[PDB]
């Protein structure tokens with residue numbers, strides 16, 4: 070039971086719990102105890118919530134950011150369904166009320182006691198919301214499908230809640246002694262050290278002498294730094310870099326001079342180094358776990374006298390004219406100006422806190438103590454301000470603790486929109502228990518959808534040693550917190566476990582035998598008991614509310630590309646057509662870049678919708694779940710503009726010229742005046758994806774990676790190369806699109822200038838929120854993507870949105886780019 074839950078978590082996280090105990094570190098032991106307690110208290114509250122409050126945890130509503138419609142309804146036990154026609158503006162209780170009135174006539178004799186469950190889905194309909202605000206209903210409007218829902222009584226929800234139960238005196242200069250190590254390289258060796266407190270150095274760099282190449286070396290040199298022992302800030306970071314010289318990089322290593330309990334670190338320390346591709350402060354403050362092959366370094370940290378960092382009480386005891394002109398990087402005369410006027414910054418420019426923190430001297434403990442005094446009575450800044458404060462440039466913990474006080478006011482949906490970045494910031498952390506972790510973990514245990522996504526965001530990075538312990542430990546506390554969801558997640562891992570083995574079997578066979586022979590062999594490998602049991606009946610990792618019930622083996626296949634991605638189709642009896650959903654399993658390519666690009670498109674859709682403009686965007690699911698291994702959501706009822714341009718023999722869209730093909734495919738898929746809606750659908754999405762790709766700098770755009778839905782909506786795929794790193798992009802407007810936009814006419818400036826309008830409106834709304842994009846991409850520098858490595862990459866976004874201009878200039882300049890693509894298009 071306890072052993073059963075323990076051996077489950079080990080299988081689930083992919084690391085044995087004993088592997089934590091083997092280290093015997095009191096931090097890891099303190100983390101595991103302090104968290105377990107926290108998450109168990111979270112689970113205790115969760116068990117005594119109301120039935121409607123449990124639905125908000127387990128099935129959080131899926132809402133969007135007059136004209137009646139057909140609706141199907143039924144009850145939990147029976148299969149007898151009733152069909153209604155009710156308003157888009159009707160509340161779910163008005164619908165529920167009818168469902169009782171129809172049973173009152175057939176069955177022959179209280180709405181608030183029930184909830185509306187979406188058939189064959191982990192989605193419910195409740196609350197004070199008109200039915201056109203739900204995703205499943207709004208989906209059914211556009212798509213023309215019929216909502217089929219089940220009436221679940223309060224006691225039936227409560228039956229689940231029960232079954233889903235578990236000091237300043239040290240003025241001497243700072244110094245350390247570089248003793249000895251052990252490595253392999255072909256010259257002489259040097260050991261450049263250097264202190265830091267974020268990206269900035271606490272003092273100058275101090276390189277060692279030249280020892281020879283043949284080495285298991287010894288130095289024993291007292292390296293003295295240009296900073297006092299009391300001047301050191303609580304989050305002081307000492308880095309090191311080993312390299313050969315006649316340059317030749319070899320390895321790096323870092324550590325916190327203070328321990329986790331606030332005490333200075335003592336005498337001798339062994340530091341196992343990580344390999345290089347000159348100095349790296351961002352790199353983790355934990356030794357290389359490959360204790361064997363990793364080159365080590367023993368160093369001595371002098372005995373200064375027990376010295377803890379001072380408590381807050383001790384830290385608490387210790388013209389406005391040309392001020393604004395600069396406040397909108399800065400010179401030293403300006404930096405001094407900003408530090409001098411720090412009180413009026415709190416009292417009349419609180420949102421400038423970040424620019425003020427960067428001017429303070431962290432290598433002089435007076436300026437630090439004076440800054441921390443202001444921060445204790447600084448007002449709550451908005452969410453965008455707090456996001457700026459979570460970057461690597463503000464390592465101080467009182468800042469971090471403040472940013473979390475500000476972030477606490479995030480909506481469960483905004484948290485989900487930012488969660489990816491919040492996880493990459495966990496890499497920057499110095500100690501295991503922290504606010505961010507405690508916060509994420511608490512939000513995760515109050516929302517099963519956050520719990521789900523946070524879990525896969527951690528699990529997908531376990532193959533990386535820099536974070537294996539950190540994440541493994543976090544996932545463990547989540548599993549202590551949600552013992553029922555843990556089991557739900559194990560079924561997904563085991564599905565993914567089989568999907569891996571199936572894809573290797575698919576990779577070999579496809580080389581040897583032909584495609585159809587590999588296909589019937591894939592189907593046979595699938596028909597087995599283990600595969601049918603493992604790949605069936607599970608919540609989708611791409612979306613916890615979608616249920617991947619029965620696998621339709623006949624339809625499952627694999628795309629003919631390189632990594633042979635598996636196409637896996639499903640179907641549900643209960644959900645009907647809403648259960649017929651597919652997934653794509655890729656193996657051997659990292660999908661974290663695709664996930665970020667899709668997050669950015671999903672944000673752009675949300676920003677535009679929030680300013681009344683729906684461009685009919687398609688931010689389909691993409692989810693890394695392991696080492697070069699994730700899931701992509703099959704977008705159904707769509708084809709590539711390459712397959713449509715094949716102009717296939719005796720089809721419903723036989724066209725004479727390529728330019729007409731696109732439009733002819735639309736005419737066949739949408740008969741009557743449905744075509745007018747499909748062209749309107751095409752036009753907005755076309756305008757949408759033109760702006761998103763321009764801004765995100767997505768290149769290598771060809772007919773085989775631009776799709777189009779049967780509804781008319783245009784959408785892009787393969788987001789492996791962005792920010793103009795093919796693996797400065799121009800604006801794109803293919804002639805075949807301009808034809809469909811212009812209703813198939815050579816001249817239609819009425820419909821074209823409308824389209825141009827959408828591209829301009831969308832471009833500006835993004836520019837307004839250019840900081841949000843900057844602050845989210847700023848935190849992702851922690852991930853370690855090849856194309857989001859440095860400031861030069863971020864710069865692409867600054868220059869694409871032109872944040873260093875006015876709305877006149879930016880739109881004046883953007884109007885030229887559009888014309889330059891319009892002209893280039895034949």
Ligand SMILES: CCn1ncc(-c2nc3c(O[C@H]4CCN(C(=O)C5CCOCC5)C4)ncnc3n2C)c1C
Pocket residue numbers: 626627628634636653660663689701702703704705707709786787788
């Ligand atoms: C990161 C890569 N990425 N991102 C989005 C995607 C991706 N490719 C998709 C696709 O591609 C078509 C293109 C060829 N094809 C087939 O031949 C099918 C024929 C019938 O049996 C099933 C296969 C499927 N169709 C639908 N959704 C897709 N998605 C999300 C991909 C692959």
